Every structure is written in structure tokens, then in C-alpha cells.
Paper text:
To compensate for this, archaea, prokaryotes and eukaryotes have photolyase proteins, which repair damaged DNA using the energy of visible light. The photoreceptor protein uses near-UV and visible light (300–500 nm) as an energy source to monomerize (6–4)TT [or (6–4)CC] lesions in DNA.
The cryo-structure reported in this paper increases the resolution to 1.79 Å. This is the highest resolution reported for Dm(6–4)PL in the PDB. Indeed, the mean r.m.s.d. calculated on the main-chain residues is 0.35 Å, which indicates that the position of the main chains was unchanged. Even the cryo-structure shows an unbent FAD. We conclude that the FAD is in a fully oxidized state in both of our structures. We therefore estimated the average diffraction-weighted X-ray dose during data acquisition to be approximately 3.2 MGy, which is a moderate dose in crystallography.
Author numbering: 1 to 502
Write the structure that this text describes.
Amino acid sequence: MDSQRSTLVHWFRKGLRLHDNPALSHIFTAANAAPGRYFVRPIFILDPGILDWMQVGANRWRFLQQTLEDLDNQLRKLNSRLFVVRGKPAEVFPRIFKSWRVEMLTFETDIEPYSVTRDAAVQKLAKAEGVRVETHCSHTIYNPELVIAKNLGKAPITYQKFLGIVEQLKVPKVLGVPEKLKNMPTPPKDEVEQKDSAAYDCPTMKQLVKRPEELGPNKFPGGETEALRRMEESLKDEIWVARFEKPNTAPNSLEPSTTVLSPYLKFGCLSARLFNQKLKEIIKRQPKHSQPPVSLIGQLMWREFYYTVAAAEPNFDRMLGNVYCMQIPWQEHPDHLEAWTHGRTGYPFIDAIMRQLRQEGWIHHLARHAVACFLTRGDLWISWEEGQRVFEQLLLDQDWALNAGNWMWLSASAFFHQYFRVYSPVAFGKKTDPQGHYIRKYVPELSKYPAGCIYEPWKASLVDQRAYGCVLGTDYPHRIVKHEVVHKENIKRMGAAYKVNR
Ligand SMILES: Cc1cc2nc3c(=O)[nH]c(=O)nc-3n(C[C@H](O)[C@H](O)[C@H](O)COP(=O)(O)OP(=O)(O)OC[C@H]3O[C@@H](n4cnc5c(N)ncnc54)[C@H](O)[C@@H]3O)c2cc1C
């Protein structure tokens, strides 16, 4: 096979998987249809210039490193490989369109504003250069543009309305893995590979993680292979799956009470469409089962809902200019923001959650509720954008639409408006962890406190605090605010802001 004329490119960004990947599958099918004509290059473009951006924490870089290694491993089973191309797309694509004689480029669509801008520019260049582009909406179960169209041009702004719309939509088909490449030699080295054969090899941990001191325990390895193993593990207890009720899962069990598939769904290591289809099979054969919103399918529909409102608002992650967002006069509080950011608020439940987040990169949904309420309307009266920023740095599952949507909910800025309901930083965790095992783990300086005061260590006398080895103001901070006072003030501030907006 000396005969090749062109290269077929799949561009990974999200969609970091072989299964249920129509953009990738179509490349491999086209290659096999015309033996001898094509080379195939599945690529991921890594801009070294952002390895130092503090908004990507080490834990999330490590998850990507592991994911790319797995993706490359899996593509090798198809007689292909991953090509990790270092550079910026604005410079990479002109070069490789010419160098590789690219005939077709496929990718999975992404709704985030810079991605839309970037992809429109790649698409314009491709059209000019005669490159056929095919894009697929496989990151979400439904295409937000069809949802918005079915709703007469507006995104549904309640969960029940959204369910009412998507009930009327066809469910896109879930694909298997692509065909193994037949009769295809490896691509000839381009000018970059000619100088360094390894130029497109998967990055090492050292190449990707510039701040290894931020790494915590490796609890959730990256990659499709782990994503599928973890999904199958969650699905094997079919009664647990069928009867799942999200509000009844604990925020502070030591091991996660929910699936922790969110890092996998965020990177596309797991297809949400596959997972939806598997859940539907379970629900159909388990006559006793939960329903949306609280069921596991309901959780995937939460993700769908936020992707659809976000698709219609480029400013979804900001207060100003955001069609959904109440304008609320959040205050600047640098010292309180720093304390919340580092889990030094003096409320042990809140601090344990922020410390788990920083160390491990995942915290349960209702743990996110507790700390987000505390930062914003509940206690510190700081903008939800500041909380979004910190979550963006530390979460493995950092997701532009899901982070912004849930921060607006928790701050009573959109989608949720019952701001008289406020989480108690002392009482909320006790329902599910009365001994405080979660605090003893993540705030180890309090680990000797009796369970009767570990949520509220200021209730222990100085002599008791000394006996427990941890004196407030010396070994663990005093409360930075007093919840019982400030949350009442903030309920009045929320009332005022709601009036101004009305
Ligand atoms: C302030 C705040 C910020 C959040 N930021 C993110 C984020 O950046 N990325 C993210 O993936 N989720 C985010 N969430 C939503 C949710 O808390 C996580 O999706 C969930 O904790 C992931 O754990 P799990 O995989 O065990 O979820 P499960 O309960 O097992 O749910 C399965 C999947 O459904 C989806 N899902 C579940 N709950 C929600 C929800 N409330 N909204 C949207 N999708 C949901 C996720 O893809 C999740 O993996 C945020 C929530 C809050 C309150």
C-alpha cells in the first residue's frame, strides 16, 4: 500500500473514548471502505502554554494524562494510536491540513463559548481548504438545538418543562466501538516527527503536571477503560440502581454514596448516551424503581437540562449579561473568600468538605450544596462566580455548564428561588455522619473531639479543647462569621435584591 493520497482526522477534545463516538467511527469506516487511499490520525491538541494556568489543578491534569494513555492504548487495538499534537489549533490546523493532506476532519460538538468560536474558525478554514467536516452531538443525550427548537426557540427553564420537551424527541442511536483498521500502514512521519519520532506520543505525568505538590491520592483513575469498569460496577447492584434517590444519598460517607461517574462523563470517557441506555434497560426490568428527578436517569437529565440552558446563553457562567441570572449585589470579602477557599472557615463540616475537594477532586452533590450555600446566600455573601472559580480549579468533573448552572441554583440566582431555606453548617452533616468520621478524616486536628462537639468545637471549654489537642484560634480557626446571625441578614438582602429585579 504505497498509494495513499489523503489523511482522515478525528479531533478529540471531549469525547475521549472509542465507544459511542460517531465522529471517530465514521473516520475508521471511511478508511476501511477505500483500502489504500487513506491514513488515519486521531489527534488531541495540547497547548503547552496553559500547563501553568492555575485554573486547572494537578489532580485534573493527572486525570487527563491517564485518560490520554488509555485512549492511545485502546486506539492501538484498532491498529491505530493517539497523536498528541503540541501547539495551538490556530497554528496546528493550517500546518497539518497541508502536511497530512487532510481530506476529512470530524469532532464532537462543544457548547462552551470559546469552543464555538474556535470550531467556527476551524470550520471556515476547512471549507476554504477543501476539507470535509463532520460534527456530532454525542456529548449529550439530546441535541440542545433540537430541544430549544422543539420549545419554540427558547430553552426550557424548569426541569419539568425540559422533561416535557425531551419526551417528544427521538433518542439518538448509541454506537459500539469503531472497526479495526484494515490494510493500513502507519502514517509517514511529518516534518515534526522526522525531527523527533516521539513528538506526538502521550505526555508523561512530568510533562503535564507542573505542580505535583497539588496531587492527592489517585482515587479515580482517568480513561474510558476505568469509566466502563466503574459503570459496570455501579450497575451490578441492580436494586441499588433502580431505587436510587439522589436526595437520600449521604454527602459525608467516607466512601462515595453516588456513582462518581462525573469525571468520566465530563471528559467523555463514558458516553452519557450509553449510560442512559443502560439505565433504561435496568428500569424497564425492575418494576419497583425511582423516577426523575431523584432517580439515576433523573441525574443524567439534570446534566441535559443545564447543557440546554447553557447552550442558549454565552454568559451562562457570569452574573452580568446572563438572561437567566438575578442581579444580586454580592460583596467583596477577600479574607472570608480565602478562608472558604482553603477550608479554614471554622465550621468543621464546611472545612472538611473543602479539604476533601482540594485533596481528591470530588465531593458529593450535597456537600457541594453545603459549601456553595455557605459561600453565597447562606453566610459569606460572596458572588457565586468566586465559588465557581475554585470548583473549576479543584474538581475532576469541572464542567462549564454544570458548574455555572448549579452555582446559580445554590445562590438562588436562577432555577431555584426559595431562599428562606438555608443549609445549617453545624446541623446538616449530622443526619448522615453523627460521629463526625468525615470531619475526623478531613480536619485531622479535630480528630480527638467527642462527637457531641466536633461539629461545633467552640462549645468545648478551653480545658477540654486542650485535652483534645486542638485549641480554637491556635490549632483550628474561630468561625469567620456566625451563621445564626448572618444567614438572617442575607435572607433580607436576598429579599431586597429580588424586589429590585422585580
Ligand atoms: C455548586 C455545584 C457545582 C457543581 N459543579 C459540577 C461540575 O462542575 N461538574 C459536574 O459534573 N457536576 C457538577 N455539579 C453537579 C453534581 O453535584 C455532580 O454532577 C455530582 O456530584 C457528580 O457525582 P456522581 O457522578 O456520583 O453523580 P450521580 O448522582 O451518580 O449522577 C450521575 C451523573 O449525573 C450527572 N449529575 C448528577 N447530579 C447532577 C446535577 N445536580 N447537575 C448536573 N448533572 C448532574 C453527572 O454527570 C453525574 O456524574 C455541581 C453541583 C453543585 C451544587
